[PDB]
Design an enzyme around this catalytic site. Structure first.
Site, PDB file in Angstrom:
ATOM      1  N   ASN A 198      17.686  40.493  40.391  1.00 51.25           N
ATOM      2  CA  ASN A 198      18.390  40.560  41.660  1.00 51.25           C
ATOM      3  C   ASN A 198      19.369  41.723  41.712  1.00 51.25           C
ATOM      4  OD1 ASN A 198      21.012  39.632  40.466  1.00 51.25           O
ATOM      5  ND2 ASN A 198      19.846  37.724  40.157  1.00 51.25           N
TER       6      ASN A 198
ATOM      7  N   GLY B  41      25.544  44.416  38.782  1.00 48.54           N
ATOM      8  CA  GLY B  41      24.592  43.325  38.824  1.00 48.54           C
ATOM      9  C   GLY B  41      25.072  41.915  38.564  1.00 48.54           C
TER      10      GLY B  41
ATOM     11  N   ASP C 251      26.015  38.160  38.838  1.00 53.98           N
ATOM     12  CA  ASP C 251      25.448  37.137  39.704  1.00 53.98           C
ATOM     13  C   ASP C 251      25.829  35.735  39.302  1.00 53.98           C
ATOM     14  OD1 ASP C 251      22.130  37.646  38.217  1.00 53.98           O
ATOM     15  OD2 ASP C 251      24.118  37.335  37.359  1.00 53.98           O
TER      16      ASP C 251
ATOM     17  N   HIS D  59      37.577  37.062  60.915  1.00 49.74           N
ATOM     18  CA  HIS D  59      36.639  37.981  61.535  1.00 49.74           C
ATOM     19  C   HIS D  59      35.284  37.805  60.880  1.00 49.74           C
ATOM     20  CE1 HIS D  59      36.449  40.426  57.898  1.00 49.74           C
ATOM     21  NE2 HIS D  59      37.768  40.504  57.882  1.00 49.74           N
TER      22      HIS D  59
ATOM     23  N   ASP E  10      41.102  33.438  53.931  1.00 54.58           N
ATOM     24  CA  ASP E  10      41.407  34.862  53.897  1.00 54.58           C
ATOM     25  C   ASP E  10      42.063  35.339  55.200  1.00 54.58           C
ATOM     26  OD1 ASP E  10      40.746  37.861  53.224  1.00 54.58           O
ATOM     27  OD2 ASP E  10      39.986  36.678  51.506  1.00 54.58           O
TER      28      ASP E  10
ATOM     29  N   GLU F 198      46.258  32.552  52.203  1.00 54.30           N
ATOM     30  CA  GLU F 198      46.665  33.857  51.728  1.00 54.30           C
ATOM     31  C   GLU F 198      47.490  34.515  52.809  1.00 54.30           C
ATOM     32  OE1 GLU F 198      44.209  37.439  49.838  1.00 54.30           O
ATOM     33  OE2 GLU F 198      43.986  37.161  52.029  1.00 54.30           O
TER      34      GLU F 198
ATOM     35  N   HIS G  66      41.633  41.335  42.075  1.00 54.62           N
ATOM     36  CA  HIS G  66      40.655  42.404  42.234  1.00 54.62           C
ATOM     37  C   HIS G  66      41.184  43.549  43.085  1.00 54.62           C
ATOM     38  CE1 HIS G  66      40.215  40.323  46.018  1.00 54.62           C
ATOM     39  NE2 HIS G  66      39.234  41.098  46.443  1.00 54.62           N
ATOM     40  N   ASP G  67      42.387  43.386  43.630  1.00 52.05           N
ATOM     41  CA  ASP G  67      42.968  44.429  44.460  1.00 52.05           C
ATOM     42  C   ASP G  67      44.138  45.138  43.808  1.00 52.05           C
ATOM     43  OD1 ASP G  67      41.190  43.946  46.633  1.00 52.05           O
ATOM     44  OD2 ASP G  67      42.512  42.263  47.307  1.00 52.05           O
TER      45      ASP G  67
ATOM     46  N   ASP H  60      42.151  48.947  41.717  1.00 49.02           N
ATOM     47  CA  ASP H  60      40.802  49.053  42.276  1.00 49.02           C
ATOM     48  C   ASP H  60      40.318  50.493  42.214  1.00 49.02           C
ATOM     49  OD1 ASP H  60      39.286  48.019  45.570  1.00 49.02           O
ATOM     50  OD2 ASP H  60      38.387  48.474  43.644  1.00 49.02           O
TER      51      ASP H  60
END
Ligand SMILES: [Ca+2]
Ligand SMILES: [Ca+2]
Lengths: 585, 585
Positions: A148, A169, A171, A244, A325, A354, A420-421, A465
């Site tokens: 995948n 990759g 997953d 959104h 979010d 958040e 992750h930010d 990041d």
């Protein structure tokens, strides 16, 4: 005392029930203006000539500028009126009530908490009260199926340095295959960033709210993860982006084609037609000028119903909660109702928000269970990593955020160190592990929910990041098993020490010079005092310990027994050492 | 300046929208402590390099201890972040933000109102903004139907002095026969205390929510009343007793017969069966030990739905709104849903509550439209009636309360001079008609909705219940037509001067020694000044008037035309004389 600096309100974070017959009340005042705070109360329908109840409000803490006093009122009738008796340094008696201040009680009037309904007592899931969350960024956590992986997937190595468009990759299979590892650590839940079908790399522009994106796996795979995780005692939290949708969202696509004649024209915020153009957006979108993310009109019941259905779907797959979010942009009505739904399907589902600003309007109990505790991160970064502030200041920021919301929320706020930010905390400490450990030690002993960003437990480093999203290091040899074992021990202690999970927080000692901070977690009779020597020097400290809290303590990290003499505990901390003293009860 | 005394929050009464794109902001600080409050703001996602928009916060008022600054923010993006810039008497400047205080803008942090959804903009019925309500006590207003009088009814005469068990036969038919009178007086709505099937005299212990008490009339008559009133431009407001029902309530009686076998036992709060006893009760009741009034469990979906249906039934009859009774004792959830039902049925239906304490939590816009202004009454009693407080003190109470809730609510608060549970205001004025008249003048020109107690307009008098519940005086020679014409004129003026209904309020003059108070209501370019000389002596005063707001004024009550010279206005008032200066704009 400066009367204009004393504050209270029979609501919000200053007056709230903890049970049907117990009302908590907080009072703020100029630091030092009040030395003794007592509450005199009674049933709201009590006769005027009746004896008032007494309740002393102990000093709950102080921050940069204010003192906070807290009391617990027994209200068997579930209805209570009360007035504050504040005593100053020179013995002055000032009454404080709804009417205002006065030396005569009657002229102060009284505050009133009209009525306590059980349906309004702030309640959160029990497992979440002692959970340890683990954030997983799917694309970089683990590749369990190469079939995948999109074209261009790069090599999975410790020396790899990701770029904005890089692909590794990762997953879901990967996750399933690593649950054994995660189980060993002791995490109680997994938090995934967006992972629903989307045409972009980040997946925040949802293309299909009902399907796992092909590059991560399929519905059958997700179910497997849910179960396999479940039997290891690990819950699953999905990231919902309802503010959104993506520009591939089926409903939006119909608008891009049928324009004014689109059955969903009112599902979004459209200025005028034609429906679009390049580099220019004629419809509201996420943030500013982001055509790929058209804002959803959650105020529209049809939109509401769809999103709820999206919610129903995945909870049916067995997930345990949602991390909302950019929730602060969705109407409260939606959230109030979303909660009602989520809880009805699973009373134990967690709802975490958040919001990067005072989130009180969402933490009254009828909406989110908790929010990301960014104030905690700012404070631990500036204190433990950069050193911009000293221990006493650290203490202030900490205390202030804590008095922000009711206790039910404070206890389940997610205490993150990074994400992750942002750059990895080890990077924030400049590669200094001695600093990293003390911060992790704190994270594991403070009030709130510890959230570990994937890899940090084995010493992963990195810049912001995308350097924070480096491939998880699985080579036992390349892992910092030393640090890993450290997390294990801490997670262990936190699970067996009821005080660390469900106890309160009171500062124990603060010294701007020694830059040493200590606090005490308490629940029932158990007390656990944490002492932080955030300084690279062997130091000695004399802590005050009223005999009432015990006469002997144990450091759970060394097994060293420390005794107190005449109300004092002498402790010796090596450079950057942290102590976890359990009162054995 | 003392920063611990400055206050603000991105919500409640200190931050709220007035439009989909306009956010009002309030800030308070120690009286005299701050001289200039500026609001620097921008969109939440605005680039850090862009210039901040500026907004001048005028001093909206000040009370016994604080100063209130208010400003209006223009948010085209419906998203806004902002910081305060405060200056002291000595020119020292400081920024105030979510982070705290600092001489540096950035270090102050920034407050944030995440997003403004149109559904969250406080909206109240347009007709309520310029209404004048007449409180009707059914049993004592007019007896149009002798055949439905209760047994033992007493003669309807002026000399009658009601007793607790008195009866006079007032009924709905009477109100109908007198609708012309109310229409002449100028009322635009009638408020009825309870009038639903009940075994008691007071009717607060509901027996049948779907039926008018036989002594008052029947559905047909009620329909007729609504229609005859409507054609006269008069609306109908009924009193909703949803907190508790009567012991004759079909549901309670069932449980009384079947104990734990009744399908309606969970509609109440019962501790143990059998359910019953006098002065002592094994079930929760309104207040303390009131058998005839068992509390309804409004949290129960069944109980909720029934009352909601009860509402539907009466709204189907054409009423214009509800007065909630002991509303602060039913859960908020109930009230939010009540509002949604109510407005969906009639967007112009009014929801007024009765809370005897800070009612902010019910006044955010998602619950009640306003409540009775018990505070107004208090200030008016002590100021105009007993004179326990002087003009400057009166000024404080008035001002403080004004700032208690959002402007949309403040604007529609029901300002009463008395009620059926209190002595008549004229009596509180010890019979002094001057003291009484002056109060009505203030009531008819101040901010909020005037509420006239039946008969006060024609000079009725009486001590508290039951002497305030004397039979309405209808014989013209026995009525005070002078008073009546007074109300009429004031009432007519309030309808023509838009300021008096939709204008804000600002204190103009306060003299503790002369006991004179003046204020100005403003809308657009129109300004109307009210000067009240609360003294039994002829007095003269100099009011300030910069040529910007006009140099010519007209006393609407006397027609006299006064002129300002050099920014000053010379005014001569007779004992207890009031003046209403309209700048003709
Ligand atoms: Ca893969
Ligand atoms: Ca009658």
């Amino acid at each position: 005392m400066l009367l204009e600096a004393i504050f209270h309100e029979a609501k919000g974070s200053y007056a709230y029930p903890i049970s049907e017959t117990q009302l908590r009340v907080r009072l703020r005042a100029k630091k030092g203006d009040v030395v003794r705070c007592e509450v005199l109360y009674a049933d709201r329908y009590a006769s005027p000539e009746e004896e008032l109840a007494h309740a002393l409000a102990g000093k709950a803490g102080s921050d940069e500028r204010f003192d906070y006093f807290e009391a617990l009122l027994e209200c068997s009738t579930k209805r209570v009126k009360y007035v504050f008796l504040l005593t100053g340094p020179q013995g002055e008696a000032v009454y404080f009530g709804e009417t205002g201040f006065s030396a005569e009680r009657s002229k102060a009037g009284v505050f009133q908490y009209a009525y306590i309904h059980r349906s309004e007592v702030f309640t959160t899931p029990e497992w979440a009260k002692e959970a340890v969350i683990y954030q997983i960024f799917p694309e970089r956590f683990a590749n369990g199926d190469p079939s995948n992986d999109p074209p261009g997937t790069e090599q999975w190595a410790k020396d790899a340095r990701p770029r904005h468009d890089s692909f590794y990759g990762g997953d879901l299979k990967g996750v399933i295959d690593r649950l054994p590892y995660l189980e060993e650590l002791g995490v109680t839940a997994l938090y995934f960033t967006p992972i629903f079908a989307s045409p972009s790399h980040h997946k925040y522009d949802t293309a299909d709210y009902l399907a796992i994106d092909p590059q991560f796996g399929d519905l059958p795979t997700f179910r497997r993860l849910v179960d396999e995780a479940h039997r290891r005692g690990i819950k699953i939290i999905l990231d919902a982006v309802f503010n959104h949708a993506g520009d591939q969202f089926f409903a939006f696509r119909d608008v891009l084609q049928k324009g004014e004649q689109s059955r969903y024209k009112d599902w979004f915020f459209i200025e005028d037609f034609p429906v679009s153009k390049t580099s220019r957006t004629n419809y509201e979108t996420a943030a500013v000028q982001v055509p790929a993310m058209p804002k959803l009109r959650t105020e529209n019941p049809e939109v509401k119903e769809y999103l709820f259905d999206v919610a129903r779907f995945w909870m049916e797959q067995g997930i345990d909660g949602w991390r909302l979010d950019v929730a602060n942009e969705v109407d409260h009505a939606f959230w109030r109702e979303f909660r009602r739904l989520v809880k009805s399907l699973n009373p134990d589902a967690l709802i975490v928000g958040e919001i990067w600003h005072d989130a009180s309007g969402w933490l009254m109990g009828d909406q989110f269970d908790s929010v990301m505790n960014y104030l905690f991160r700012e404070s631990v970064i500036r204190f433990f990593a950069t050193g911009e502030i000293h221990a006493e200041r650290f203490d202030a920021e900490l205390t202030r955020a804590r008095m922000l919301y009711p206790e039910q929320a404070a206890q389940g706020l997610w205490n993150l160190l990074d994400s992750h930010d942002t750059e990895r905390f080890l990077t924030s400490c400049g590669g200094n592990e001695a600093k990293f450990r003390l911060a992790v030690l704190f994270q594991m002993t403070y009030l709130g929910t510890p959230l570990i960003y994937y890899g940090d437990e084995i010493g992963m480093a990195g810049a912001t990041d995308p350097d924070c999203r480096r491939p998880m290091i699985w080579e036992e040899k390349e892992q910092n098993r030393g640090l890993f074992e450290f997390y294990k021990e801490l997670i262990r202690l936190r699970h067996r020490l009821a005080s660390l999970t469900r106890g309160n927080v009171r500062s124990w000692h603060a010294d701007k010079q020694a830059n040493l901070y200590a606090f005490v977690r308490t629940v029932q009779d158990q007390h656990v005092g944490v002492v932080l020597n955030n300084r690279g020097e062997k130091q000695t400290v004399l802590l005050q310990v009223p005999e009432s809290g015990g006469k002997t303590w144990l450091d759970c990290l060394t097994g060293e027994e420390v005794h107190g003499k005449q109300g004092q505990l002498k402790l010796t901390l090596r450079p950057y050492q942290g102590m976890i003293l359990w009162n054995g009860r």
